[model samples]
Target: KEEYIATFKGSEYFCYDLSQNPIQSSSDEITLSFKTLQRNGLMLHTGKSADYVNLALKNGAVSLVINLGSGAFEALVEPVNGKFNDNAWHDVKVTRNLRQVTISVDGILTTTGYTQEDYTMLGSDDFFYVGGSPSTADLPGSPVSNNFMGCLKEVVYKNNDVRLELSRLAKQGDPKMKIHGVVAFKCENVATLDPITFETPESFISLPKWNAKKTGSISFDFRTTEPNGLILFSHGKPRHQKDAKHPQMIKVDFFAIEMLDGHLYLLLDMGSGTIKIKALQKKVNDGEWYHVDFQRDGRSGTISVNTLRTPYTAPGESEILDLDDELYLGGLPENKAGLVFPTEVWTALLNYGYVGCIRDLFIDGQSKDIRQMAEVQSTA
Candidate 1:
């Protein structure tokens, strides 16, 4: 196969099957060339258990880290003349012979290191990746959690008896190749996901219906100076309740996260009763970024703001949480006719929309493309 460039958009990645090409030999060679303007990103990685190999670009310098069931052994090759993130192509060669591992860039800058004497072979079994992985943070000995954002060409794997052209095989639509996200086979300029700002109280975005019936989790980062706003909200099918006093009330299973009087709160109802728990004690309206995590399993869950955590349990025997509406983010609209507003959610009733910056939203360990969704919806 001819050499071709595969552009990584930081969110996209490619994985090749390693069952036919396991890395169990004492001697191996890997050659690849990349062009990027990123200072920190994972270039290539593969591992299992305690053994792994991580080749990444750290602070505009090539860094090779390997762990052969012993510990982390690193060899950083810094360019003497200039930086590597100058939007120019640079070739990388990684050669391993027993305990000695050598890494070089452009044949001019080279660094070598020796592994532990107890381990002679690299027993990585699952698969090998060219651009990145689904979760970079889960990889062993990885310095950066962000994937590579650039073009990679001529990703070749050579052991004692076999040679595999990874980039070419992926481009040719090999059955053993598994592509994730939008990976362009030819070189293209891909933009990174940026943080979006909610400028007004009327601006908001609608997310797809979350089917987190028995278990659910959502996390995001937000920065704001405002005192009150609704960050997330969702509700289930409405049900009629009979009581001796009013007798004209409808209750629904709902979940919400809001900031009232500079303190974060988590409100949830799983068929029985509503539980309002303060996620943090201190006021968080200091115009700084804060991380909020909300997770629920069955009738019990925990909500966390920054480092503080608050646990709560929903009342009743039913563990199912049924929601039939789309998840609302940032804030609710002015014409929220079909939306249900539980009495516990003060932000929804008082009309407080979020006016700040939000980014990196993940639901159930999968990243949600909120920036793209906001852009496509033209939400200010």
Candidate 2:
């Protein structure tokens, strides 16, 4: 009776010698545990599919117990709310007897008493699959549905009730931070706003007027027919003193044009009525799609183009003016004099905002379509 190690698909599997580990045949109970690093899903399988087996939970459902050849069984425990997807280490334990099965996750009981037909059979070629299945023999295949798609690490197996102690699951990669309404440019229909009210304008501005609302961050991706530029207007002052030198109001502009030299040249309007072209080469161009991510933390704000690298930085932060304003795309305000007036401030604004243009916009981390991984179904 000795331990055996097998490698498959860049993962390791451990097989304990039942003769030495002292497995109880009368009860048909076995306890197992393993660790995984990849976001890929994991599963536990018995060597044979025809043996009677039961699983129980003592701690959490960090570990799963498999009953060979038994299709009717219970997933003894449930995962803690918000704990399963934290990308941190966790511990799970399971216990089983002839009467019932129990599963625990992270030292918490999730579910118990699941019933299924007893079909456990520990064949002579007893083995387990780690990251993926060894063969497709056990379950029928479906279209678009195959095996798990992530990585796994830290595997442990126990043959008997030895009351195995569960260790923490391995941690890997950074925790996922998801934004719900990160894209806003993709919104549909503009007639929702009333005619008298200019609450929802049709352009992106640093500080927009007309009771516009800013939720979390301003981020989007846009494309144009040629090397057309974009203008981001700041909120203006009162009607009597609507000038370039209005207090608490400043307008800044940026330009990007495709050049024969095979790169997009960037121009910055410093709000002081002057333009400055950075020494760095701007390779993005017209007709192609580019991403612009603008984030403000307190008084400081950074504008990252294409990637997370900040190309433009500014001090002072702007607040959202309206929560239910209509977002304007394609063009700016024609009259720069109304309550929702546009400033000559960013004169680099482009006209006819390109017909085939598409804006993949996001606001406040929410999106149009959001689904969970568990809810993700395979059409196959």
Candidate 3:
């Protein structure tokens, strides 16, 4: 692997929740021609995770390889997409696993090459590129595919940037290399000393009298280090998801609030159907406490953080939901609470335990100091 270092006037940044959905590596680069004069030609270059991929020319040959941290690596499958050589429109793909790299021409592949604990490197804060590298200088640092020889179209990676739209993501230097992403920061385990304990998939606390019909607000002050964590949730009963082929496919008649991609999200479930609304992104994970206030009145739902707010209204008749379940704080009830629980009750919880702390909690103007409000049940 060589390094081609050039300080572009600017660069773009992106974040992902690969933890939610994972994938091996893949990409598409289509063009009509390549600049034969360039020393090392590159059509696409990618970075912002563990390593990078260079779909480039080494002495006129596409040295499509994955720089999996230490080694360099491509693949395609199915109906071959495109090909190399002579003037013509072409679509190419490269897929890589820790053990194999498959290259596809319009989805068909004849090339594959060994690949991954190193794959974990995909967790991150990173960038994507479509046209060009860091800089186009001739050095044994990286590839130089910036100065191509034709109109470029439909360059994609991991399903994002299918058309490689530069205006939305690229500060002009960019891959619509988006993927559906997390990086837990360096912090104590659950930040004890405070009131923190890690939540397994379902480590959540229930709100008292949460099913009561009320019109007011819920507010809290807290901090977190994980990119995705459940903040709050409450609901009606659950049911077998309609149109499901699997018993495990259940539907939730509930509402929730969570922290994702630096923003506060509100999941509102009115009779109209469940809807998700989000506040502007806030950095609650940067070791600082932020405030949240979610208020609902009749048909209207509003989520506010600091001064940012997003409102959602019922599509038709405002739903009057009388939930049967208690409000879920942090996450859902643990699975061990067990199968005795209703399928309608069980499948409704999208249990992603909260990873931080709650200092102040107010429901309908009432303060809820969770630790102090806790009760110990007696054994009968």
Each model's TM-score? 0.54, 0.32, 0.41
Q: Least accurate stretch of 10 residues (summed lDDT) in model 3? A: 180-189
RMSD to true structure for each model, in Å: 12.4, 14.5, 21.3
Which pairs of residues collide in model 1?
none
RMSD of 3: 21.3
lDDT of 3 by residue, 1-58 (tens): 1211111111211222233334333433323222232323455555544566556644
| Each model's lDDT | 0.80, 0.33, 0.48
lDDT of 1 by residue, 1-380 (tens): 46778877566688988787577878888899998878878888888678888899999988898777766679777777768887788999999887789988899856788887478777777878878898987888888888988888998888887687888887887887887754557653322234678899778998887767999889877778899999888888777644523422658888888989898888888888888888888888897767788888999888888777888888998787787768888898667666777878889889998888776677886668787789888564
- State the lDDT of candidate 2 residue by residue for 12-47, as single tens digits: 122222333434432333333333222223333434
Q: Rank the candidates by lDDT, best first.
A: 1, 3, 2
Measured on C-alpha atoms, candidate 3 has an lDDT of: 0.48
Query: How many clashes (backbone N, Cα, C below 3 Å) per candidate?
Result: 0, 62, 34
